Amino acid sequence: FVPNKEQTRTVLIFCFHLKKTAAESHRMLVEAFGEQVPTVKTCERWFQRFKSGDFDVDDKEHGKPPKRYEDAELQALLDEDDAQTQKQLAEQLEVSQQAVSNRLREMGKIQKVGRWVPHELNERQMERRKNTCEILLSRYKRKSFLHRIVTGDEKWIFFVNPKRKKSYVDPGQPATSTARPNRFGKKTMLCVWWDQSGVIYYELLKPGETVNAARYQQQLINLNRALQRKRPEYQKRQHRVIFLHANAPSHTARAVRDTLETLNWEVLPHAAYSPDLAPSDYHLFASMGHALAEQRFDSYESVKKWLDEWFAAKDDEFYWRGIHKLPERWEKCVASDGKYFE
Amino acid sequence: FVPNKEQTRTVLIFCFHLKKTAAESHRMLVEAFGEQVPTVKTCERWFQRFKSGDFDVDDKEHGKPPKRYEDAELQALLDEDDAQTQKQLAEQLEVSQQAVSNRLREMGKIQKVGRWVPHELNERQMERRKNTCEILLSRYKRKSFLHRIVTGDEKWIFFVNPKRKKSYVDPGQPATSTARPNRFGKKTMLCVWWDQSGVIYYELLKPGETVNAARYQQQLINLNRALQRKRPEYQKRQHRVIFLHANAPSHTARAVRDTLETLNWEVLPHAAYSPDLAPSDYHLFASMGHALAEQRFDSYESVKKWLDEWFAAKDDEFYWRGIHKLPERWEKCVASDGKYFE
DNA sequence: GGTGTACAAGTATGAAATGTCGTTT
DNA sequence: AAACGACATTTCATACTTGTACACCTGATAG
DNA sequence: GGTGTACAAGTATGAAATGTCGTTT
DNA sequence: AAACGACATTTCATACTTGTACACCTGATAG
């Protein structure tokens, strides 16, 4: 009925503690469970190991084939090139693909996708960015000027922004498919300026309408009006407002370049290809990106009506937080020697 | 000092098979290991179970808490909408998100991202496809004409095709990042026509150049001329040519529409928004897509050279299979009611 | 910048499994 | 002694909870 | 259909574990 | 007898190998 290599050795422990002999136990063993029991020679050996003081009922580790390549030998490949295929590594290790699968899960390794990054910068752009951030930081060290900062940027809002569905289902079964987004589709073109205390002023352009040097100039003033009545502490300190914006063509034309001299603001330095230093981009629009995902607008009216609901829901401190992230981002901008950071 | 619930119960199997008494075994037990051993009452019990026949060393299933929901309750949720989040399913079951993660592993379930499908068809756009397939089948069934088929479309070839990187590394470590593709970067349009016996004629337009109804007209002759050299069997059968091409605007302007009548080619019916019935798309370009991935070009020259080598590498079997995938795709087209099929 | 999924550690369930101790064999 | 019979007291997977780690998402740019 | 990963069986490793003997406590 | 030394035989978790199964890619549209 009840033999078992593990159970048998347990019985040998029991006999040995009762102080019975090796051979005697082997007779009691055969008396209980019949002939199929082991030899006395093993009982003697097991007893031998008990006299040593080692009551482990499991085997010691058997012999095994030699490793065809070392763990640190694989890691050396990944050091030079983070991202290769299993079959690419397997090929370099004179081994099969699935062997490499195993070693990878055996080591601490997982597969995670790379980050997209805005642009392929040169040493040129990197030095500019680095220096700008170096400059903006040193000033913040002396005097914290973020309370004075007002920023804005412009962002397309598509009427239909479908996200790919991801469904929970039994293997081999098809998941829910979604229709692709046709680039040439209805899209308003939100323009928005804001500060640490909230959103100041925004214009949602009509389908297809955009921003030329004339339209922007007209916006800067429409802003300053709404800014005067929204921010009391401004009318006196009309020269103390710090303006942060993108280096677009309509953001440099004479007609506008002028309008900022007459408004008498301080245009903040903003390096080339630097969305990661642009509050509106990394914080405001980022947040929005989520809220917009798989959201569907039929008419401009609903878009403008959605914007308003959104902007309102947001607490003042959300925007505050976005602005007061500039310092830490500058600390990374510099630390990374001008490259993009996480 | 080697007691253990499993081991101890194993010892009572031994004493029992040595036809000793319950209170006997107990004494030997306390004699062997020490006072840290079960009471006689338990030995009396375990003996009872050895008389029924059962020698199960492990316990029977203990008391356990009641299931808050059921496995088919959750499956109902997935049957109506299979692509919810765990929190969303949890919410409906008055249970935590985590509690759902598990039950989903417990059941056979895995998460998988759905497929992109090129457009959102409406009933009219659907039935159009269904009908055009229905008809093309009914003809094929009668007589195979794919041998006469000669299709062709056009496709952009960016000079830089960057693809997101996938690295192997320890949890919480950065992966190899990639600089985004420049929408308005160098690209050459490729215009190519082919048939089951292989590529017939192609033109690689220069950076920025585009097909205008006049150009397409010219192209159709250059094709035709190139066609009768490469395909002998059309000198004789000069009206047998079947022509499958996209419903573009250049492909309908009268200047062209005449040219096709003067050449006297049977133009094949093609439904709108149906690149999944267009060999040039779903087969010939689909292949390139992989071959192009992570490939970089520097000059118009480099691309032209690569194309050739690629067209040569392709054995004639390839071109044949793409064309004769038609009847399959039609038959699925019509079966899915004009909807897209995977 | 926000969200989704799956690890890690705590609580409570509740039928085994177990100690007590006078009673029956 | 030897084993039961009721009645009390501890085990321990289990079906959840909460806390937390962390992939991967979101915004881009300039023209 | 193309490419990449991971599951499922199959196969030889090779030191332990076990057996078989003629020896010595 | 009861246990040891050699010397020959069987185990069994490994480290790999084919075959798969199967997730996700890749081509888009028309104005």
Residue numbers in the entry:
A (entry chain B), B (entry chain A): 4 to 345
The authors write:
The C-terminal, RNaseH-like catalytic domain contains a DDD/E motif, conserved in other transposases, recombination-activation gene (RAG) recombinases and retroviral integrases, which coordinates the metals required for catalysis. The eukaryotic mariner transposase Mos1 assembles as a homodimer and brings the Mos1 transposon ends together in a paired-end complex (PEC) for excision.
To establish the structural role of flanking DNA in accurate second strand cleavage, we have determined the crystal structure of a pre-TS cleavage Mos1 PEC. To trap the Mos1 PEC conformation before TS cleavage, we created a catalytically defective Mos1 transposase by mutating the second amino acid residue of the catalytic DDD triad (D249) to alanine. To prepare the pre-TS cleavage Mos1 PEC, we designed a DNA substrate incorporating the IR sequence plus five nucleotides of unpaired TS-flanking DNA, including the TpA dinucleotide abutting the transposon end. Crystals of the pre-TS cleavage Mos1 PEC diffracted X-rays to 3.09 Å resolution and exhibited C-centred orthorhombic symmetry. The pre-TS cleavage Mos1 PEC structure contains a transposase dimer and two DNA substrates arranged in trans. Each TS is routed through an active site and the backbone is intact at the IR-flanking DNA junction, consistent with a pre-TS cleavage state. As predicted, we do not observe Mg2+ ions bound to either site 1 or site 2 in the active site of the catalytically defective T216A/D294A mutant transposase. The TS backbone twists as it passes through the active site; T57 is de-stacked from adjacent nucleotides with the base flipped into a hydrophobic pocket lined by residues of the conserved WVPHEL and YSPDL motifs. The aromatic rings of H122 and Y276 stack at the base of the pocket, so that only a pyrimidine base is accommodated, while a hydrogen bond between the backbone carbonyl of P121 and the N3H of T57 confers base specificity. By contrast, there are no base-specific interactions with A58, providing a molecular explanation for the report that TS cleavage tolerates any base in this position.
